[PDB]
Design an enzyme around this catalytic site. Structure first.
Site: not given
Ligand SMILES: C=C[C@H]1CN(Cc2ccccn2)C(=O)[C@@H]2CCC[C@H]1N2[S@@](=O)(=NC)c1cc(Cl)cc(Cl)c1
Length: 127
Positions: A45, A75, A55-56, A118
């Site tokens: 992703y 999420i 952001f990622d 995304f």
């Molecule tokens: C860093 C990997 C996950 C993070 N999470 C789960 C999660 C776990 C712990 C704290 C906050 N969120 C997520 O639910 C979602 C969806 C899956 C892909 C990534 N995220 S994310 O891309 N969502 C805006 C994300 C979320 C964060 Cl807090 C940082 C970054 Cl660099 C990227």
């Protein structure tokens, strides 16, 4: 660009039909089967904020992101969205904050009340 297009042309995939998660299928995947609850899913992703900033990205890490579907490990929009995808599918999701990080945000990249974009590729899923 792509975020505007999914905002304006995406399909509501929420059970509530509240437009909180919109989807466009960009690359059609394989067969008819979608993952089931509890499956190990492997995705690539990239995410952008509404200010245009990346952001990622898992691509940039050279490894997929792996989680168990339907368990709140991600999420809400990801549990909802990935559940709709076939193996090999690429999709765009446009996510309102109620299906993401809400008013809290996620320090330090994601502000309060953030709508997210995304591009997601479902690589594989396995029980
Ligand atoms: C860093 C990997 C996950 C993070 N999470 C789960 C999660 C776990 C712990 C704290 C906050 N969120 C997520 O639910 C979602 C969806 C899956 C892909 C990534 N995220 S994310 O891309 N969502 C805006 C994300 C979320 C964060 Cl807090 C940082 C970054 Cl660099 C990227």
């Amino acid at each position: 660009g792509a975020p505007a297009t999914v905002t304006e042309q995406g399909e509501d995939i929420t059970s509530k039909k509240d437009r909180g998660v919109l989807k466009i299928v960009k690359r059609v995947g394989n067969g008819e089967e979608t993952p089931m609850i509890g499956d190990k899913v492997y995705v690539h992703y990239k995410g952008k904020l509404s200010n245009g900033k990346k952001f990622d990205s898992s691509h940039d890490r050279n490894e997929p992101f792996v989680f168990s579907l339907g368990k709140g490990q991600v999420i809400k929009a990801w549990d909802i969205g990935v559940a709709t995808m076939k193996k090999g599918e690429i999709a765009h999701l446009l996510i309102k904050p109620e299906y993401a990080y809400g008013s809290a945000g996620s320090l330090p990249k994601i502000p309060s009340n953030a709508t997210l974009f995304f591009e997601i590729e479902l690589l594989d899923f396995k029980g």
